[PDB]
Structure formats: structure tokens, C-alpha cells
């Protein structure tokens, strides 16, 4: 754990170094290095120059500040100078064609998570392969081909299915992807069907994929969630910890999971700034709102676009607003704007990440007791956990001799059994929200939920041209 | 744009008004008698009968070149039946003068069909029904003459298309090809477009390969399934020609009130406004005799409910919906005291009720299990990030719907699809309590043209128009 | 026709009265003793034996020795005290009483008396071919073989299944008609398709078919005809009461086997009618019979209520409803020594119509073919579709003739399955109500307060010692 | 026979007391230290380890001696020591007392140990969630056929899975399993097990095992106490003029088994040492260990905690809220006396099938046949209708595929009906003073009924 945060602190400091120099290369001032927008541009720029299969002057649209006002600028640097900064900071490493698949894959994951909060899909045109309703399973879909194998665990079932669908139109790329899909998928006939993949027709592989994709909208898959912030926010931490002796050091807050990752976020919010200008997504005449933007930033850093809005409302220091109630723009440097600082104590509560199966078909960190064996001849109702028995039977009663048609029916009947149980179904049983002060998890709390939990919901309160359209 | 449509509709409405006015002159119908609903029903039907070549060629006598039309003749609030007459070419001359027709008569035939559906459970005084009695609610456009079936296809129910398929299957036991395709190929394509997605649509593809036994079971299964797995049928406000003439007169005689082009709509609030405006000057007949008992006097408010129900095709609609928008208490079929709407031997003239619709709605037209307008979304579930205990938020109905569209194989036999249809019924029936049609569909006040104040009606109770009550009029 | 029905019924009732009064005279039963239920039970049973041409032809074939005397155990009384007596008459006299009053037609007449006796026995005893748990489907199972064909519609699915099993067992040492009768009663669907295939089925398949159709009918309720079958003495108590109070409704006014007039004929018979109270009950020869307990069984036997929902019956009677083993009632046979107790008038304070069709269908003002709505307006609403009626519609309309035995068996299991899950929405006799006896014109319909155990044969802590 | 059995039990318990008292002399256990539960546990295990013929066949350098870990008290504080006796001296104790003869008594001795272990810790053959069906799992294969009835479906399935990984012992086990299983298609599949392929065999075992979590099996239960606790009953009875005799308390079922348990707690002892299960630094709690002991004696590890709570005169705590170590001799430790009247309520044992309660106050009426056309809901018992269809509509012609499908819908019907499912209908709780079941009582059942529930008030 301390051994972990020490390995984290090393890579974070090395990223602050890369970020500080690239800003110097592109003429970003010391105060402007703390504008979130500049980090989006700098990190993107690195990914573009690094993109070997895409392959000198380099251009970077950035923000320039003057008092409280801001303006966009076009920075310029030489391509050899850009590659020399990475080479000189990262010595005995960089052997990867994509600099470091982790390093840039994380910057690309933040960019993907922000895109998910800002748009249902609507940015990368409409190059969709899967149905519109399966987009909540499309975590990390904005990622480049390069970063998907290394950023696998963070990827959604929809993303992996889309990658397989694109492929269809020591190792094997197709086998590699179905393997990642197999690990993510809810245990049972869906995993059996993955093992039977490549034994299928081109017409059957499609049914296989689309079925497992649809089924996962109820039979939840396992996806890894980390706290991914822009580099300029890790700079704000490093700065605040050094400008404040008593406060927690960068090493203490150098985490991507647990309470330290939430403290890392709030301490970054002391010195971090964002831009505010005219125009929002789909309406150029509406002004950007500072509280609405802050929500989208906190959601982007945690990948909250598909999370239960009620869970989110419980940890947030501002009222939770649905997507089309927010007045927020591109996050790209505005032509003209104003500087707005970040909200210091945004996250009053914190929570652990649900990195494993939400229904917990194995009960790894749970009690294994699902029923009682009667000793006394005393009247009692049935005490058997119906959903855990359903989870166990699907996992346990798999027929290896089963045909594609046999497996297709078993998945449909797995969906039905859980859909008939709908009201009693519980995800992440045993998981609670804790206060920031509550480091030890000594005092658990219930989020107190009810009503629409969909972020991409259309409401009467929606902003003109959005959810109204 | 909606204005380009209203201008086009107002042109059709004005041609129809002229055809009507000219036909009334030829049959000696007084200026005031032109506004009697019954006269429109008789003139429209006459125009349909004369222009039907199949019936005119089979009719052949002097009487074959004659056109008899039972009309209402009123004195001073009191009316009487009269046999109007014109020669066949004089009827065809009026048509040649106003027009340079098929679709025009199809619409008139759709009002008569929707009036018949409200008036009768059977509708034709004939027990020769191809479908099971309980599937009568899927018989939109059943009374519609074979000629008008292709043009009005969209307005027809699954039961009307299935009984048309069954008709072809009975004759071809005991042939045409107009497109490109054959009448049966055309009919199964129409059913496939209406039918709820999933195995029912897949059984439509395999239909031409099915043997006469599998074919009949297929039809009945798709028909029974359609009673929960609601099909796609288009609806329009189709009112008589005399009612459009009563819209014309009122807009002319009253400045500031919307024009005929403003009210020229068969959809939205402007259709409700056109119906409500048409009722300022329209009239109908009240006589002795109702459907069932020949000695019961007709009720005015009861006849006004049927008229309203005929124009919007509300026979098979949820009574609680209709109740929330009409200006009288909603009565079930057999509580109503109304006659066949044909001109009576003797009766009294009654004016329609102005502002009969206090509330309005838009038409279904798409699959009812799908959502309506701007206000829904595409998000069906959540993807948990924080390990915090929460219930399943997945939309079971929307997921069931997505899986019906997305999970198609092509490699399923008759029997396999038959079980898949039955399971599809099972899945939705098991969901009854939380199953909802037209999610995002609201009721609006008549004055609320903007749709700024959406309202959900106070549902519950028996929804069926053809249910029996204690109040059921003696003999019915 | 409803008034014409009662006139035709009265003609039969008056003929039954004449047969009954003349038999009592032949058997030396006094005018006051003719109103005793136990004598009506004994006299009707007696006639069924004398008219049993199979037994009677065999009885003289076994015989000079042809002593054709008819013996009958009867109740004789001295006001409130009563005692058993053995009556006697000659077969030619018993036969002449039939011929003189009537004129083939006698079968239907005796078939009904035997039905009242099966209905009486279904109440008194809960108990050999079918499973014990399926006994609630064995109505008319005490009817002798000769009466089962006439009284077909009154027979339970278990009674018909028992007859089919009995034919199949004798064939292991006609059926076609029993199958047709079973087919009619059964809930439509794969159970009816399994009836059509039954002659092609092997002996193992045949046995599984009958057992499954029976088990399934315990939820997928069959059609059984019900009429109010009252003993002959009871109809005599109506005749006598009607000609006593001239203002009160006549016999013709109360000559009904169904509706409020049947319930009114019952309450009228109750003024003058009498039964016996003795020492000994069913299962316990030491316990004294209770009057209110015996009156409950009488009303139940007259309406065939043994298997009917307890809560429904409870809501219609003038006494607190008791489960079978809370009752102190013996045989309805003449006691050796006992007392005379008159029946309880106004026993039924509420009435209802008989449910002779499939329970899952609708009754009264709900018999309409409309079971769904076709959406015209884009207005948010729940689905209005009648799930049980739609499941019944698919059962009749669909179903493959290309179905094998195992295909049809798996389908029955699946049909029982859907309805077992549908149990929240499942309503039997929908649109049917309970009415105050005073309300003839079915106005002000009431709904019984149902909840708790509805099984008459349930075991409680109130259960009488030995039972 | 009820008091004739007590006579046969008294004879057997006394033989055990004689074997025990002699073994304790062989290993140098002081008269006071004989009444320590931990000493009865080690002595019993020693006799099983010495009577293990194959293990003795398995083994100058040969130490043909017996080694036993025992508790040595002194004052009130205690210690752990290693006792030794010559193997033929130990054998002579068994010959002096006994001349089935030994296997049955050591089987029950092993059965108490399995019950103790199941209350202490939550099997590699079966899935983890199926552990509540593994009664008698700890038993060595010598004891399994003898104690058959007492074994859980999980145990029997793991015995079959072991044979597969290599009458016959397989045929034996399948018929033992057939008797236990919920009646219907599971019992039919058991009959087909010989004709199933190895893949179908594994599916059948796991499906039968998983099903049993809802479709409850038939398992025999008895009151099993260490020999020292019966030595305590034998001591206490001879002391009080009012007190019932040992023969009067010689029961393994009914009220007398509870009165025997309580009478034993007046003179029996255990130890409070440093170290609990998992946390080698936490001090053991007396009342906590007393709950484990009562639960071990009655095999209550998997029983509904709410039932157990209503019967015991101390607050019911879930497994990880307990400060209890293994019942092995502790290095340091302090002698703690057992609690004199632990059970204030009692109940009879299950032993039969928990769902089908034949007779009791449950009649054959399962449904109603409507007469009047009155609106009402369906009154038909689904549970009972499902149960009847399993007896009446069995198809011998069914293959593996068809029987598996039927198991699944049998589970599905029961899962759907969970709200209306009741186990041991007409089964009640009674006061210890209520000897002839006159005033039945019902336990207040509401919360989580699982003993192995994690809780917030846990122990790290």
C-alpha cells in the first residue's frame, strides 16, 4: 500500500515533469499550466506525436490568461524538441512505440471518460456498430487501437464487442479480445458461448455478440474503475502539498482508489482552474455555468457518466443535475473567456470502486452462506437467497456438449430469471458511502436513493436545443 | 413545414366541399340540409357505389343508369326520409367538373368503417368473420371495401390484414400480380410492417415456405400475440364532408376565429379544433329506434359521443383516455341509445355539441411499446463505478424490446419461431403490472396548443368500450 | 321462457311429491313423519334399488323363493322423540305408484335423487383410483354407474378420470364417450389435444395422460354443472307452506334449481322441514349430534358445497361457518333413538348464481369478447390486456396437431406453469357477485370478505376428538 | 420402547464413561481434569487414531506408542501437556470394556468433532455456497456408511466426486443420496447415474447439490456430547435427591437430550486462553465458547439463528462476532465452568423432509371446486400441486436432458413460491419445564438467519 503509493508518486512526478516541459515548449506560463483545458491539449498533442501508425512542426491550441480573462492561442514547437522532452525525462524505458501504453493510455482514458459525460456518442460522428441503448457498456470507447490492449480492464463489454465487430469486418488479436470479453462477462452461458466462439458462422458470431451485449445490460459485467485526473491537476496537488507543510504530502494522496484518491481530487481543486465562455454543447448562444462544468470534471475524473445519479448526488457538494440540465461546453480552449477556479471540497463523501462483478457470482469478499439447513422440527419460511442461487446455478450447471442454439436459450433464460426478480436484485451488497474524515470506514452510510438514476435522461428542466432539440 | 401541409389539405378539403355541395344540388338537398351528418354519410356512400366498376358491371335495365340515394329532408326542426335521384352520368359529370379520386373515397370509406366499428361489435350484420371473436379489437378498417385496402393499408389493423390473407388462402384451395408482387406477397409485407418486432416478423419471412396448416396456425398465433404485443397502426381525424363544410361556413361567418387552412389538419390540436369548430353548425337526426330496440328514442348526447368516436376511430381505444377529453360522461356501448345513423322515416334535427373536446392528444401511429416524442432518452440501465449497494435500475420492458429487434438468427424453423412467439407473449405478460404503452405521451388542454402543460389521465376501471354493465339499455 | 321453465319444473316437482307421499303411505309413514329428511333419503334410496332393473333381474335369477318384499329403515316420531322402524311394501305396489304418477323418464328423476346423496356424502366423508389430493375434482363420484351417463354434466373431472381408469383396468383382464365428456370439462389447450390423441396412446401414456390432466385441473379449473338438488320431502314442505300462506309465493313461483328462487325455495322448505338429532357422530359414536352443525351439512348437500371456498359459503349463511371436523353430525340415516329438530328458516341470508362454465372466464355483466385495447392516442398507459383470457385464447386458436405425446405433456406442464406464475392476476368467476336474498333484480352487488383458509376439509385445533 | 431405548443408551453411555475414565488414567489426567471438554475431545480423537486399522497398517526407530495432547489444570489456571501410553494398554482398555461394537460409538465421537469444526470454520470438491449442505463432512471414510443418515447431500456428493476422480462404494453412495434428495426428478436422475457419461455425471451432482439449497434434503440429527459431559451427568445425578437419574437423561433426541445437555453444564469445564480463531492475540470469551459448545452438541452451524436464539438463555451472536479459539489444549489458559442451564427452550429434531410434513394438521385438500359464480382469486396450493405432480406424473422414458430441465423448473417453481414456502409446518418450540408439549410457542423470525453472517460488529 505504502509500497504502491511510492511507485505511484514516481510515475506522477515523471508526468508532472513531462507536462511542465511541454508547456514551456509551447509557451504556457507558470500560472496558465494550472488551467485544466491546457492539460487536455498537451496530453492529446503527446498522443498525436507519439501515434507511430499515423506517421516537423507541432501545433497546440491552448489558453492564455490576463488577470481574470482568458483567450485561446496557437502554440508552436518543433517535432524533434517534443520527442526530446519525452526521451530526456523518460530514459531507460520509452521502448514502446506508443511512449508507454500505461502513461498515454491513462491520458486517453481520462479523455474518453470526459467524452462519455459530454456526449452519448455525438462527437466521433456516428461510426456505431452496436445499438444506441447499449452505450452504457461502452466505457473507454474513444480510445485509439494502441491503448485498448493495455487499458483492457477499464474497457466496457460494448467497446470490446465493437472491437471484435470491426476485426470481423503466442497470441491472436481476435482470440485476445474474446478472452477479455470472456473475463468481463457475467458467469454462465455467456462465458460458455465465448469458448465456442470461432467455431461459429459469421451470421452466428453476430448473434453471439449482440446477445451477450444486450444480456449484460442486466447481467452486469466486471469493469475496472480508477481515479484518472488530467496532469495539471496532479501538478496542483504537488504545488499545494509543497506550499502547505502540515497538509498531506503528494505521496499520501498518490492513489487512484480509495479515500486517498478522493483527497487527491479535493486538494487538486485548491489551485486548479478551468475556462468559462459563451457557448455550450449544441447552443452557441448559452453561457457556460461554473457549477455545471465542475460536475462534468468530477464525473470525468471518476468515469461517472453511466453511474447511478443518486449514488453521485450523495457524495457531491452541489445539487446533482442530469446531462441536459447542465450548461457546459467542449472543454477545448475557448476563443475568449474567463478563468474560474475549481470547488475545493467537492467530494463530502467517498466510496471504494466496484472493480469486480456487481452481482458477485463468486462472493469473494462476501459470506458464502446462501441457505439454512434445518436441525429442529420448527416452522420457518424459506431463507434461501434466490438471486445468489440463480448466480451459482448459472456458474455451476454448464453443459460442455451444448450447441450454439442450446447456449442462446440458456442466456435468454438467464436474462428472464434475473428480470423476473428485478425488484429484489441487489448490486454491490455490502458497499457503503463514507465521509472524507472517515478514513477507517468505521461509520458506514446509505446514499438514500429513489427515482430516475439515468444521467442521459430527458427532463422538463432541460436547457434549450438539448433534450428538447 | 406544417404550413405547406395545411395549404395542401385545405385544397383537398375545398375540392371535397365542392363535390359535396354540387352532389347535394343534383339530389335536391336544401342549403340547410347540407349540414345534416346523415346526408354526408349517404352522399359519400353513393359516390363510392357509382365509382365502383366491379359492382356497376355486375349490375348489368333503366334502374342501372339511375342513382337512388336516401336523404334527410327537414322542415323546421322536424325531418323526414326522402328518396333522392340522379342519372349515373350527372353524378360522373360533377366529378369531372371539380376534378381533372381513389384515395379521396378511401378516406370517406374509413370514416364509415370507424362509425360501424363504434356502432357494432361485428359491424356488417354478418357472422362470416375469419378471426376469433376476441381478436375483433385488431380489426381497424374491417368494413373498408377491398378497393380502398391498398391505399389505406396503414390505417388497417393486424386482424384486417390477417382476415384478408385467410380470404386468399381459402379461395386458393377452392390470381393476380400488380406491383411486380402478388396480393398475398403484398399482404404478408403489410402485416410484417405492422407486427411487433421479434419472432413474429421472422415468421412472416418464412410464411411463403409454410404449408397450409402451418400458415393458419401462424396467422392465429401472430393475431393472438398482437393483443399484448401491440402492433403499429396509423390514425387520422377523418370526419364527414358536411363537417368540413361546417368548418368552412364558421371560419367565413366568424372573423378572428381560425380559417379553414388553419384548421386543415388530420393530426394534432388543429384536428381537435377543426372537430370542435365543425360542431358549431353541424346537425344530426334523433328518432324512435336504436340499434337493438326499435321502440327506444335516440339520445342526443349519446349520438354525439358516437360521432366523436367515429371521427377519431375510438371504438377499440381505452375508455378512460376518451373520458378525460370529451365534454359528456363517457358511456359504454350498450349504455348508449343510438340508431344506425341512416336517414330516419321521421325524426327531430339536433345540433352537434360545440367544444366537445376539452382535452387533446397526438396519435399513436408507431409501435405502442416504443416511446413518444421529445422527453424520453436511449439510456436503459446504469454501469456501476462505486462499490455501493444499489437495486437493479434496468428497464425490463425496454431491454425485452431491444432483444426482440437485436436477437435475430434467420436459421429458425416454424416450430422454433412458434415457441419464441409464445415466450415473447410470456415475457411481456409476466411484466403486466409495470408494462406501459406510449411512455412520454400526455393529454393537453384544448387551449394548450403549445403542449406546455402535459397531463396524465386518471386511469383505472374497465377500459373496454364493448363491456357489459347493469345500466345496459334493455334488449342490449 | 324463464316463467315457462318454472311451470315445466313445477310439473316435475308435483310428480316427485306425489311419488314420495304415496311411498310413505305404502311404507306406513305418518303425515307429520313425511316432513323428516331421513325418511326422504331412505324412500328415494329405496326407489333407486327397486328401479335398478340390473340388480332386480339378478335378484329373482338367484331364486317359491321369490319373496319380493321391499324393506326400508325409517324414522317414526312421538312429537319430539323419534325412533327407527323397519317399513315394508310389495314391489308391484312401489312399481304401480311410479306408473300411476308418471307413465326411460324415471332415470333422470332418480339420477337427481342419487346426486343429492353423492352431494351429501361429499360433505360427510372426504373419502381408490386417483390420488387423494385430487378428491376436490371428484363430484358425483358416489353416483352408481347407471346414473353417471344422464348426470354427465354434474360429474367432476376426477369422477370421469376414475371411470376411464376403471375401463382400462377391466381391459387388463364406451371409453370413447367418457373421453368426449372429459374433453368438454377440461380447460382448453394441450389437455384437450391429449384427449383427441388418447386412443393412439399406449397403456403407460394413457395412465400418465389421465393423472396429468387431473393434477392440472387442480389449478386449470374445469367446467361442472351445478343445480340446487334438495330432497323430495323439502319440496313437499314448499307445497304445504305455499298453500298455507296464500299471500306468500306459490310452488310455481319457487320451482327453480338455480338463481334467487332456488335459494328462496330452500329457505321456504326450511319452515316445515325436520331432521333427527341422535347419539353418535361421524368418527365418534359417543358424541351427541349438534343441530346447527347438521343444518350446515344439509344446506351444503343441497347446493353441493363440499369443495366450494369456505369464505364464499360463510358470507351467505345465518350461522358461523365451521370446517368439516369442527362439526358434530352423524349419518343422515334413521337413528335407533333420538329427537326431532326442525330445520333453520332463513339459513341463506345471501344468494349467488351457479358457475357452470370455465371459472377463468367471466360471469354476469362481464361476458364480453373484448379483452384488449388498440391504442389510438399517444397517451401513457398500462397494458389493459386480460392475461388469463389471452392465455385461454391461444390455447383454443393455436396448438399444433403435429404434436407428439411428450410434446403435449411438456405443454400441459408449461400451461400449469404460466397460470401458477400469473396467480396475482388470476381471478375465478370474474364479474360474479353475492346478493342479499331480498334483492331479486341483482342490484347492489356485494363482494365477500375473502382471506384465510378456504378448504372445508382442513384440520384445525377446534377439531372434534377422534376426527 | 421410548424408556427401553433410554436403558440401552444408559448401558452404552456407561461403557463410554468406563473407556474414557481408563484412558484418562493411562494418560495421567487428574480426577478434576477429567471433566474438561478439551480432554474428552483429545482422548476421543486418540481412540479413533489408534482404532484406524489402515493408518496403523501404514506404519528400532518405530515408536509403537500413543501420543495425546492434554490439558493439565492446577489451582484454576491451566497448561497444555503431551501424554503417552503404550498402544496395547490402550487396546486392552477397549477389550476390558467391549470384549458396530466400537465403530458406531467412535462414529458419533467423529460426528461431534465434525459438528464442532462446522461451527468453528466454514471442502474443495463442491462450490463454497453449498457448504450448508455438508453435515458430517469431517468424517474419515471409515465412519461415513455407519453415520450415513447424519451426512449432508454435500458430503455424499463430495464422496461420489472423489470416487470419480481416480454393491460398489459408488452404488452405495448414490442410493444414500437418493434417499436424502427432495422427491421427484432429482431422485429419478439418481436412478440414471450409472448410465450417464462423466460430463453428464458432474452436471447431475452439481445441479442436485445446488437444488438442495431450496429443495431441502432429509438429514438425521442427534444430540452428541463428548464423553466427559456424560461423565458430568453421571456425577451430578448422584448428588441431588430431586434430580433425575442418568438413565432418566439417557436421550439423544427430545426434551431429555436438552435436560441431559443442561445437567452436564453444572459440572463440565472448558478453557479461556490467549488467542481466538484467526486472531492469535485476542482473549477468548466464556459465554462465546459456551454458544459454540451448545451449537456443536446439537449440530446448529447451518440452522436458522432465530430458532437457536429463542431456545438459548444468552444473546445469539453470529460466527465472526465470537471470541472463540479452536477447542485444542491451550499453552497457558484459565479453567472456565460451563453454563448450568443454557437451554431455556427445546424442540424435536427434523430428520424427515422439511417441506412435506405428512399428517400433523395438514389435510389432503389442496384446491377448491367452485359452485357459485362469485369473483375470487385462485386458492390452489402451488407448493403442494408441484409436489403431487412429482409423485403422480413421473415419466420413466425421460432422458438426462429432460430430467435436468425438470430439476430446473422444480427449482424455479419453488423459487417463485419462496414467500409462501414454509419448512417443518406444525413444528413448535417448548419451555424446558414443558415436558409433554402442552403449551407450544413460536420463535420470533425476522432478521438474517445465517450464522456465518458478515456483520458490522465483527472481530478482526
Residue numbers in the entry:
A (entry chain A): 9 to 63, 81 to 194, 215 to 514
B (entry chain D): 8 to 67, 77 to 116, 125 to 198, 206 to 210, 215 to 511
C (entry chain C): 8 to 70, 77 to 116, 123 to 146, 153 to 198, 218 to 511
D (entry chain B): 8 to 66, 77 to 116, 123 to 145, 152 to 195, 216 to 509
Pull text from the paper.
Full length D/NP was crystallized in sodium malonate as small fine needles that diffract X-rays up to 2.4 Å resolution. The structure was solved by molecular replacement using a starting model of the monomer of the A/NP R416A mutant. The molecular replacement using the tetrameric B/NP model did not give any acceptable solutions. The asymmetric unit contained four molecules arranged as a tetramer, consistent with the observations made by electron microscopy. Based on the electron density, 87% of the model could be built, from residues 8 to 514. Several internal loops were missing and the C-terminal 50 residues were disordered. The oligomerization-loop of one protomer plugged into a cavity of its neighbour. The loop was then stabilized by several kind of contacts; mainly hydrophobic (by the side chain of the strictly conserved Phe-421 and Val-423) and of several aromatic residues lying in the pocket of the neighbouring monomer but also the salt bridge between an arginine from one monomer (Arg-425) interacting with a glutamate of the neighbour (Glu-352). The overall folds of A/NP, B/NP, ISA/NP and D/NP were very similar with root-mean-square deviations (rmsd) between 1.6 Å (for 383 Cα for the comparison A/NP with B/NP) and 2.9 Å (for 340 Cα for the comparison D/NP with ISA/NP). Twenty or 71 residues without any structure are found N-terminally before the cores of A/ and B/NP whereas for D/NP, the core starts with a very short version of an N-terminal tail (only 7 residues), which seems to be compensated by the presence of a carboxy-terminal NPTAIL of 51 residues. The sequence analysis of D/NP showed no import signals in its N-terminal part but suggested the presence of a bipartite NLS within D/NPTAIL (514KRR-X14-KKRGR535).
All these results suggested it was a new genus of the Orthomyxoviridae, temporarily named C/swine/Oklahoma/1334/2011 (C/swine/OK) and then Influenza D virus (IDV). In this paper, we characterized D/NP and solved the X-ray structure of its tetramer. We demonstrated that the C-terminal D/NPTAIL presents all the characteristics of an intrinsically disordered protein and that is involved in the nuclear import through its interaction with cellular importins-α.
